[PDB]
Design an enzyme around this catalytic site. Sequence first.
Site, PDB file in Angstrom:
ATOM      1  N   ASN B   9      17.921  -6.927   9.562  1.00  0.00           N
ATOM      2  CA  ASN B   9      17.320  -5.624   9.370  1.00  0.00           C
ATOM      3  C   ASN B   9      15.947  -5.619  10.029  1.00  0.00           C
ATOM      4  O   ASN B   9      14.981  -6.218   9.495  1.00  0.00           O
ATOM      5  CB  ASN B   9      17.196  -5.332   7.869  1.00  0.00           C
ATOM      6  CG  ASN B   9      16.554  -3.974   7.613  1.00  0.00           C
ATOM      7  OD1 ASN B   9      16.285  -3.174   8.513  1.00  0.00           O
ATOM      8  ND2 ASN B   9      16.291  -3.732   6.343  1.00  0.00           N
ATOM      9  N   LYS B  11      13.907  -3.282  10.337  1.00  0.00           N
ATOM     10  CA  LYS B  11      13.014  -2.298   9.700  1.00  0.00           C
ATOM     11  C   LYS B  11      12.310  -1.471  10.793  1.00  0.00           C
ATOM     12  O   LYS B  11      12.923  -1.219  11.834  1.00  0.00           O
ATOM     13  CB  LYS B  11      12.117  -2.959   8.680  1.00  0.00           C
ATOM     14  CG  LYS B  11      12.854  -3.795   7.664  1.00  0.00           C
ATOM     15  CD  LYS B  11      11.971  -4.308   6.551  1.00  0.00           C
ATOM     16  CE  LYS B  11      12.888  -5.099   5.567  1.00  0.00           C
ATOM     17  NZ  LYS B  11      12.043  -5.519   4.398  1.00  0.00           N
ATOM     18  N   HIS B  94      18.910   0.383   0.645  1.00  0.00           N
ATOM     19  CA  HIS B  94      17.819  -0.554   0.787  1.00  0.00           C
ATOM     20  C   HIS B  94      16.717  -0.197  -0.223  1.00  0.00           C
ATOM     21  O   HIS B  94      16.426   0.992  -0.433  1.00  0.00           O
ATOM     22  CB  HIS B  94      17.240  -0.561   2.220  1.00  0.00           C
ATOM     23  CG  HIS B  94      16.403  -1.772   2.409  1.00  0.00           C
ATOM     24  ND1 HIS B  94      15.066  -1.805   2.073  1.00  0.00           N
ATOM     25  CD2 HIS B  94      16.720  -2.998   2.860  1.00  0.00           C
ATOM     26  CE1 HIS B  94      14.602  -3.016   2.292  1.00  0.00           C
ATOM     27  NE2 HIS B  94      15.578  -3.751   2.788  1.00  0.00           N
ATOM     28  N   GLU B  96      13.534  -0.124   0.003  1.00  0.00           N
ATOM     29  CA  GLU B  96      12.503   0.715   0.580  1.00  0.00           C
ATOM     30  C   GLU B  96      12.928   2.185   0.571  1.00  0.00           C
ATOM     31  O   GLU B  96      12.081   3.081   0.449  1.00  0.00           O
ATOM     32  CB  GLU B  96      12.084   0.231   1.990  1.00  0.00           C
ATOM     33  CG  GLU B  96      11.418  -1.144   1.950  1.00  0.00           C
ATOM     34  CD  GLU B  96      11.594  -2.025   3.173  1.00  0.00           C
ATOM     35  OE1 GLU B  96      11.223  -3.242   3.049  1.00  0.00           O
ATOM     36  OE2 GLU B  96      12.088  -1.606   4.256  1.00  0.00           O
ATOM     37  N   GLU B 164      19.365  -8.199  -3.153  1.00  0.00           N
ATOM     38  CA  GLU B 164      17.986  -8.455  -2.754  1.00  0.00           C
ATOM     39  C   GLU B 164      17.056  -8.190  -3.918  1.00  0.00           C
ATOM     40  O   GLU B 164      16.733  -7.019  -4.171  1.00  0.00           O
ATOM     41  CB  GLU B 164      17.534  -7.648  -1.534  1.00  0.00           C
ATOM     42  CG  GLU B 164      18.480  -7.662  -0.367  1.00  0.00           C
ATOM     43  CD  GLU B 164      17.912  -7.058   0.908  1.00  0.00           C
ATOM     44  OE1 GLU B 164      17.809  -5.816   1.012  1.00  0.00           O
ATOM     45  OE2 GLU B 164      17.574  -7.813   1.869  1.00  0.00           O
ATOM     46  N   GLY B 170       9.853  -9.334   1.565  1.00  0.00           N
ATOM     47  CA  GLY B 170       8.635  -9.449   2.302  1.00  0.00           C
ATOM     48  C   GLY B 170       7.524 -10.302   1.752  1.00  0.00           C
ATOM     49  O   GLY B 170       6.480 -10.402   2.409  1.00  0.00           O
ATOM     50  N   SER B 210      13.158 -12.635   1.620  1.00  0.00           N
ATOM     51  CA  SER B 210      12.467 -13.812   2.145  1.00  0.00           C
ATOM     52  C   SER B 210      13.445 -14.961   2.454  1.00  0.00           C
ATOM     53  O   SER B 210      13.147 -16.136   2.320  1.00  0.00           O
ATOM     54  CB  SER B 210      11.365 -14.263   1.220  1.00  0.00           C
ATOM     55  OG  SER B 210      10.400 -13.205   0.969  1.00  0.00           O
TER      56      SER B 210
END
Lengths: 247, 247
Positions: B9, B11, B94, B96, B164, B170, B210
């Site tokens: 991904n 992003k 996702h 986000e 996730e 991140g 991560s």
Amino acid sequence: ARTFFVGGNFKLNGSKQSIKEIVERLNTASIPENVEVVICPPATYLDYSVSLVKKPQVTVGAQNAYLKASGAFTGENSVDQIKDVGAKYVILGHSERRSYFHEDDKFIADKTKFALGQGVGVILCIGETLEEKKAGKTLDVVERQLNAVLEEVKDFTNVVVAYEPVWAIGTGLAATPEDAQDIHASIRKFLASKLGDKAASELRILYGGSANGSNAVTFKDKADVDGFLVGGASLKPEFVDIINSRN
Amino acid sequence: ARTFFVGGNFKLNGSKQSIKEIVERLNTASIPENVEVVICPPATYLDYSVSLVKKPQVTVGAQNAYLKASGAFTGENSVDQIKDVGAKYVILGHSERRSYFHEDDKFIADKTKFALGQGVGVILCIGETLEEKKAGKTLDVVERQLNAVLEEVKDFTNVVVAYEPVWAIGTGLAATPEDAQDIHASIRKFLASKLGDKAASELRILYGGSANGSNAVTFKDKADVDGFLVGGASLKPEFVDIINSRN
């Protein structure tokens, strides 16, 4: 004075084949010298669209972007990426984003400031709802939307404003040319007080909301209407008739 | 057997040049035959990315799309347009998007159904926040997120699930292989009760948050961890080491 500007917002429409047909039509069409045309395809087709354009009067824009150029924002578009593939504008604040995607006035302001600082022009959209219009709030609404932007953005040289009454978007119920003209004249005087007399006189203020090949000519003598933001008709041959409506 | 799957991904990152370098490195990489690698660039680069791939193991995905294929949805991506340019997957749900862009569980469910019916695979993301983990709610959250999808989606043949933990995205703070394994086994058991034993046995369940070139190999013997959804490291040479982590 002000160069006539016609934006085509394809919205969520197109394929490689159908966009090729739209762009070749523009390449081969009769377009005046003194017009600026900006076509705004889905992000998936930005690079391809740029690659097809051959007409100097035609450039490409995106339909939305985020307020950062990079980072952990899965699914967003970036103004730096839009610029990388040769596009020159981004639409910010479209009603469909303010409404369905809950983009508030400050979000739009922050995006506009960011885009301009990256060297990408902005098609900034404003407009009132049917309820707002009937209650007498049209100018209060658009001045609120503009004020948010003006808190962050002090120079509109690379901005074009699109006044699109929400109730006119997709419905066939366009504003009358006289009502549009009156609203645009009020917006321009408001902006002269914020940006100065010169900048107000240079700023393109577009009408959008069911603008088509038949009604565009009805706006020909409205001095404060500087072009159109065209949705559905931008997919169709009559887009060229809109571009030529000031002949 | 479940084919090891590695999603990248990107992003909101990349340029034509830096994506060309990523794809060319994959094209010439020494990787096993029996791996599935899906790179997910910004929408602006989907067509270009597809055009550059020369590696049977590698296909392209999008980072988000809407729940309709066309219409008046300024700024969205369309699964039909993603398919038109040769991409094979879309990331849906996702963190986000669920968090910052307030995409609710029903919105994700409706998008997942729509994508699959248009013949596009889905990388379906689920996961808990730090507060939810501390409260004992990890399995309650991921089962709620999955249940919303299962109301609409009855066949996961063209689905990959990415677990996730939000607190791992991140930050550098990954789940341990033991903890991920136990959660993945619990998710698989739950899904067998809903989708049947055959489907649960065939479903890839990826770890993300991560996942990097140093820790991926530490998951090599975890039977219910079928691959990775990789954010930051998908931009870097170590993405290939992740693909090779089960060698």
